[PDB]
Design a protein around this ligand. Structure first.
Ligand SMILES: O=C1N2C=C(c3ccc(O)cc3)N=C(Cc3ccccc3)C2=N[C@]1(O)Cc1ccc(O)cc1
Ligand SMILES: [Cl-]
Length: 194
């Protein structure tokens, strides 16, 4: 064996990365008081999204576990209000941890959250999400309600031979979009998210 240096592509001080997360923070900050909690995020995931997607009790439970792990990775814990500066600092730590797992080819928290979301739409067990299924998610989660933005997502990604999207591709895109500000990921959510 031998050691090999890999560049963890981060640009945490770039306004484009900061604004991307500020947009999402405001999106989660429903009442606009500048504070959100893990409790609210989990309620959104379980009581709102999974309920409307009619996910099974077990799929909802698994999805919740992934959401809890993901945002705890950002330093969020139940019962504690979080303002943007802390939220952003948490994303810096999450991104760094994720990118290291990525370089070591160990499953990331974003990949696992992805598995849980794709599972909900896995009617035939092939593990793919169709454009119509993504449009449903975009509208219900509210991250991308625009049909055109949802089509932009699929157009942006490299789809399988049937025109559908798989988790392996989406995970790579999400990593570049949320963690690294990779130019290859720009436009992932169309005009829905900067
Ligand atoms: O990536 C995704 N997200 C990132 C953020 C988000 C939140 C805050 C930030 O600062 C940055 C990004 N918020 C939501 C929407 C959401 C939020 C809370 C609870 C449930 C859903 C969201 N849904 C995902 O498409 C779901 C998903 C994950 C992996 C896949 O392969 C496919 C689909
Ligand atoms: Cl992966």
């Amino acid at each position: 064996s031998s050691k090999y240096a890999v560049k963890l592509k981060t640009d945490f001080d770039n306004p484009r990365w900061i604004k991307r997360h500020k947009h999402m923070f405001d999106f989660l900050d429903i009442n606009g008081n500048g504070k959100i909690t893990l409790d609210e995020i989990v309620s959104k995931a379980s009581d709102d999204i999974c309920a409307k997607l009619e996910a099974t009790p077990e799929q909802t439970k698994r999805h919740q576990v992934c959401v809890e792990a993901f945002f705890r990775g950002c330093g969020m814990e139940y019962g504690k209000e979080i303002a943007f500066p802390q939220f952003l600092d948490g994303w810096k730590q999450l991104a760094t941890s994720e990118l290291k797992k990525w370089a070591r080819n160990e499953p990331t928290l974003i990949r696992e959250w992805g598995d849980a979301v794709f599972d909900i739409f896995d009617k035939d067990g092939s593990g793919t999400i169709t454009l119509d299924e993504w449009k449903a998610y975009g509208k219900i989660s509210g991250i991308s309600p625009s049909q055109e933005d949802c089509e932009a997502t699929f157009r942006h990604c490299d789809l399988d031979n049937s025109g559908d999207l798989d988790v392996d591709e989406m995970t790579r895109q999400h990593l570049g979009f949320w963690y690294t500000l990779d130019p290859e990921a720009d436009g992932l959510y169309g005009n829905g998210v900067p």
